[PDB]
């Protein structure tokens, strides 16, 4: 088999994370998770997980990739072969994430194609998909729903009144999802990655458009009330466990933690490459992107609350369609709104596409690290690219149906951004800190970076990330409140069971692999554990 390649440049690693873990989890997910959990009170567990767990486990995952020169799963066969199920857990998480993430890009593409005509369809109440309750935004103050909300709910989503009624497959979103999957297949199976083009247009224009949205949102009237909602916290909201777990999994979501993606991108690093300053600068880039886009979108929501004469927490969707309400509403107040809509949904497509390329690459890299000499370079590996893309498309068709928004919120809360992320992050930190050793891994890091990680990273992998993950997990279990879509829908018991099935299929890769390896090896159980804890 051919040897595993390294990056062609120092900036090829940096541009693969900066498009990889700086994506829709910043401009789309952090806004509605902040919105749904009260705005101000979301930021305290956000920053607690960001410093205690986010950047530490992000650098930990990249530096695990750099040490082992392996991606996702087989990186754990040189650290602790007993806990190799962290890799399979990461692969399950990244597969479910690939499915619903590409569904987000399908919604963005449908908004992009619906932006091509000269009048934006979410701007006025004259269309077939609206209701008699439709009042224009300016006419609200002079049970009324805005045109952006009914556009999102009744043209894009075509929202059935339950998950029990899937309705019919929306061929608009189905063809949009197929187009984005053909784009993802053409950027992996060709292996282009736009190496001569991602230096400027990919790297800057999403952030330039985010700055444009910042300037637009701060100039809307009533943006100060929205920023007050965004920043000023409710301490009584922190007593509820959803704020803590939602912020922690948003941190573990934005950073591509528990996915194998950052191990895979770190696996292409050179051995004697200082990843620490790159990891810190790019983590600051990711968290700053989320926090800046939060300022923009919550200034827009404060304007929307001012214009419609309703409270800030009730003006838009407390669910996964906030970036498709507030941001299009802000687009409808830019000069020449059609062109700015085209640029915005090209922004969301660029961010989500760069992410989806990077985590599809991480999933493929993990699954070819499992089997060398089978998916070598082509004529068998290229078929498996199309197989992964086709199965993830067919699983993504369940979020295209008229009740597929509920399936999306199920996947988003449970499949790849919930207790599964806390589970795998706790197991990564526990393995590295105690079964490998903070001092042994620090010796490895000094051997290859140049210096040992400080008392921040060492004590974060040792104590802080395990206590945060264990506390948030048991705090969500002992004060359990079930999943609700847009604060009004109550999910049925089979839907909560399906979400827990996705989460546990992410979780149960670790105990299944532990039991499988403790059953395969011969000897007494203490000898079996002591053999499987030794790295290979």
């Amino acid at each position: 088999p051919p040897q595993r390649e390294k990056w062609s440049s120092k900036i090829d690693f940096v541009l693969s994370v900066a498009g990889g873990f700086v994506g829709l989890g910043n401009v789309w997910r952090f806004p509605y998770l902040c919105y749904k959990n009260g705005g101000g009170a979301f930021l305290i567990p956000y920053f607690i997980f960001l410093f205690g767990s986010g950047l530490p486990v992000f650098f930990l995952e990249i530096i695990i990739g750099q040490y082992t020169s392996e991606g996702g799963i087989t990186c754990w066969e040189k650290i602790c072969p007993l806990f190799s199920g962290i890799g399979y857990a990461s692969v399950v998480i990244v597969s479910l994430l690939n499915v619903y993430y590409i569904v987000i890009l399908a919604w963005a593409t449908y908004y992009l194609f619906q932006s091509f005509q000269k009048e934006l369809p979410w701007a006025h109440c004259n269309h077939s998909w609206n209701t008699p309750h439709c009042m224009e935004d300016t006419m609200r103050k002079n049970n009324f729903t805005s045109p952006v909300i009914e556009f999102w709910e009744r043209n894009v989503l075509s929202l059935s009144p339950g998950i029990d009624h899937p309705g019919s497959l929306k061929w608009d979103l189905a063809l949009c999802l197929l187009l984005v999957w053909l784009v993802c297949f053409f950027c992996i199976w060709k292996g282009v990655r736009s190496t001569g083009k991602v230096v400027y247009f990919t790297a800057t224009f999403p952030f330039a458009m985010l700055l444009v949205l910042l300037v637009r949102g701060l100039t809307l009237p009533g943006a100060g009330a929205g920023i007050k909602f965004y920043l000023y916290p409710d301490i009584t909201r922190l007593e509820d466990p959803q704020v803590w777990i939602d912020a922690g999994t948003q941190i573990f979501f934005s950073y591509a933690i528990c996915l194998g993606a950052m191990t895979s991108l770190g696996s292409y690093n050179k051995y004697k490459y200082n990843s620490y300053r790159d990891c810190m600068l790019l983590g600051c880039l990711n968290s700053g992107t989320s926090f800046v886009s939060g300022f923009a979108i919550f200034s827009i929501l404060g304007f929307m609350a001012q214009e419609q004469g309703v409270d800030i927490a009730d003006v838009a969707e407390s669910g996964p369609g906030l970036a498709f309400i507030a941001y299009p509403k802000a687009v409808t107040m830019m000069p020449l709104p059609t062109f700015w809509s085209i640029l915005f949904f090209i922004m969301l497509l660029l961010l989500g596409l760069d992410s989806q390329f990077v985590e599809v690459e991480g999933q493929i890299t993990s699954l070819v690290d499992l089997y060398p000499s089978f998916l070598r370079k082509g004529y068998r590996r290229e078929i498996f690219i199309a197989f992964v893309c086709s199965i993830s498309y067919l699983l993504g068709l369940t979020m295209v149906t008229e009740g597929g928004m509920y399936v999306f919120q199920l996947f988003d809360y449970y499949a790849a951004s919930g207790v599964c992320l806390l589970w795998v992050a706790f197991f990564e930190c526990f393995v590295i800190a105690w079964i490998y050793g903070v001092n042994r891994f620090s010796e490895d890091i000094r051997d290859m970076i140049g210096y040992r990680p400080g008392p921040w990273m060492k004590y974060s992998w040792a104590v802080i990330t395990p206590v945060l993950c264990v506390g948030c997990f048991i705090f969500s279990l002992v004060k359990y409140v079930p999943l609700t879509y847009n604060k009004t829908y109550v999910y049925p018991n089979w839907a909560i069971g399906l979400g827990w099935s996705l989460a546990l299929s992410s979780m149960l890769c670790v105990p299944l692999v532990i039991v499988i390896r403790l059953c395969q090896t011969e000897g007494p159980f203490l000898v079996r554990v002591k053999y499987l804890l030794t790295p290979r």
């Epitope: 004697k272 001092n439 620090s442 000094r446 051997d447 210096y451």
Partner: antibody, heavy 118, light 108 residues
Framework: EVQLVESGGGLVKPGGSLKLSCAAS????????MSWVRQSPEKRLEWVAE????????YYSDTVTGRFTISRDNARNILHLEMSSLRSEDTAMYYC????????????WGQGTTLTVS | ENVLTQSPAIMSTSPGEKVTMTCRAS???????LHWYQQKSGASPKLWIY???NLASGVPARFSGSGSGTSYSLTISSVEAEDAATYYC?????????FGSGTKLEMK
Amino acid sequence: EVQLVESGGGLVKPGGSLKLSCAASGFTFSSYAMSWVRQSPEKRLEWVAEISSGGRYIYYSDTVTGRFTISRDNARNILHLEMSSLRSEDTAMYYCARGEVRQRGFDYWGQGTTLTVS
Amino acid sequence: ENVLTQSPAIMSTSPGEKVTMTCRASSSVGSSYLHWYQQKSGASPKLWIYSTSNLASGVPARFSGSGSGTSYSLTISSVEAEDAATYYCQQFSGYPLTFGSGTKLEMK
């Protein structure tokens, strides 16, 4: 007060052996990689051998690449250097240098041990 | 090996005069890995400038370092009588670590 005290300085025959002993004090010896750096009578410094924090990464220069052995004793906070097949062009003045951060270098050195081969 | 060809050892300058000494590397040092050591007469070397720009503890502000990649330089703004020593550059990047040759600074 970080203090490195080297021991084992003396004359050996050609083809002989010697075992130096950098006895460190005032700091946690387990958390810093240690390097042996020798100084020729022409005052040309040459790095000899580096051992990592826990002793799993061991590096040698090409002049001692197959006949020098460097070890630690983290319980006693002492560093070693085992020599074999000591030739004539190995007479030097041996320092142990606390080189742990590669971007900070050999920040703390110690005393010396004159190794003489004749 | 990464042979660090340094400035010639025999240099003699008056006190209070700005001096410099260069350090040419055969390979490319990463400019955060090349350090400078001051060894006095009959004493052990000590770290003087690390990562070719920063000043170690106990090093006066009159010392400075510059350069990157191949050429690296140590510069004294005003040489005193206590600056009479031998200075070695040292890349601390490649696993066969190499010190530079001597550059002996003596008075007049």
